């Protein structure tokens, strides 16, 4: 059959570009991510540097198939996240996250934090109250949202809300 013969060729050529185009998408996607993470780390490292007071020189973010691993360089030897102290952990975690924001925006003027603390911890809570006063107050405006009364004395303005009789009420404090 004539017609059925050609639709096979046409099909074949098209297969060639729909296939060679996919490849590029595969290439770029890669690169986009490769760089993106490099620059994110260059930042994350520094942001992390001031969070620990030099204790940790560089953070390492490297991408792999369906997985991005973080390493903290200690005594030259690369090391696992579990190698860090509970605080150093929430630290790196945060340091990383901001690093992204800083990458994606370039500048951090506003910053909305929707509850980072895990049910009023003390180990973490502490480090945060630290990271809070020695670094974050630096930012123009940060809207922290948490249920850990503790934090109440490091934040500039405490504005307590509470579900009082169905409707929510806003009670200022400072």
């Amino acid at each position: 059959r004539e017609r059925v013969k050609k639709e096979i060729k046409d099909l074949e050529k098209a297969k060639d570009f729909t296939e060679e185009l996919i490849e590029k998408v595969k290439k770029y996607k890669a690169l986009a991510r490769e760089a993106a993470l490099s620059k994110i780390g260059e930042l994350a490292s520094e942001i992390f540097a001031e969070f620990t007071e030099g204790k940790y020189s560089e953070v390492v973010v490297r991408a792999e198939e369906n997985k991005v691993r973080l390493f903290v360089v200690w005594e030259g030897k690369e090391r696992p996240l579990t190698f860090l102290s509970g605080g150093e952990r929430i630290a790196l975690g945060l340091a990383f996250r901001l690093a992204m924001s800083l990458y994606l925006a370039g500048e951090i003027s506003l910053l909305i934090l929707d509850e980072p603390t895990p049910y009023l911890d003390e180990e973490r809570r502490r480090k945060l109250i630290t990271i809070m006063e020695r670094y974050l107050k630096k930012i123009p405006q940060v809207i922290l949202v948490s249920h850990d009364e503790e934090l109440k004395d490091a934040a500039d303005h405490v504005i307590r809300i509470s579900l009082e009789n169905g409707s929510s009420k806003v009670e200022v404090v400072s």
Binding site: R1, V4, E7, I8, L11, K15, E19, I22, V25, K26, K29, A32, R33, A36, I40, K67, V68, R69, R89, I90, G93, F96, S101, L102, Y103, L104, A105, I108, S109, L110, I112, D114, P116, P118, M132, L136, K137, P140, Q141, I143, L144, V145, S146, H147, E149, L151, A154, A155, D156, H157, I159, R160, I161, S162, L163, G166, S167, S168, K169, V173
Partner: protein, 195 residues
């Protein structure tokens, strides 16, 4: 950027909630399920409506309620002070009213057709939807999602660093190739039996 005042009325808990934001670090303290998280979502929706936020059903505003749902937000970017007003009348009425005035001198002047399409656009100019929601709004449990596993991150990073798009682009062109090969195989087996 800088948020000055959110104002929500009849969205979930909030019936007539009002907040005056300030410089420095503003801690919002409240027991759980006390509306705080809601308030954040009002702001967020107020700013980017109708674009999607978190996973908030559009109806959450549109239809729930006997009275009007209302979202008034006032903020400042690059010395300029802008203000949005999202109202939703309900019932026989069923209506939306949108308007984003800028503050020149002491009167509030519009800054785009007081429509919803308009404002949204004008917003994509003043502070793009992909930069606010994912650089400014550090959503909950994201930090931790990085302090656990490695694909929990590829997940976070994929969202946040905005790498979703690409992948799906590839997922479709790829589906398009498979849909070709099959066609070939068919046109093959037909030419077999036939010729």
């Amino acid at each position: 950027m800088k948020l000055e005042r959110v104002t929500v009325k009849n969205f979930r808990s909030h019936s007539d909630t009002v907040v005056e934001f300030k410089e420095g670090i503003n801690l919002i303290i409240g027991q759980n399920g006390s509306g705080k998280s809601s308030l954040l979502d009002a702001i967020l929706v107020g700013l980017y409506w109708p674009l999607r936020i978190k996973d908030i059903k559009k109806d959450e505003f549109t239809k729930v309620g006997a009275r009007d749902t209302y979202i008034d937000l006032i903020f400042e970017k690059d010395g300029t002070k802008y203000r949005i007003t999202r109202r939703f009348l309900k019932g026989y009425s069923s209506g939306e009213i949108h308007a984003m005035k800028r503050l020149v001198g002491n009167e509030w002047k519009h800054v785009t057709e007081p429509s919803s399409k308009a404002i949204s656009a004008f917003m994509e100019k003043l502070i793009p939807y992909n930069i606010f929601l994912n650089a400014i709004y550090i959503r909950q449990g994201q930090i931790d999602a990085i302090l656990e596993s490695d694909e929990a991150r590829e997940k976070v990073v994929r969202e946040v660093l905005n790498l979703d798009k690409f992948e799906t682009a590839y997922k479709k062109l790829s589906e398009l190739k498979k849909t070709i090969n099959n066609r070939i195989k068919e046109y093959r087996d037909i030419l077999a039996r036939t010729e």
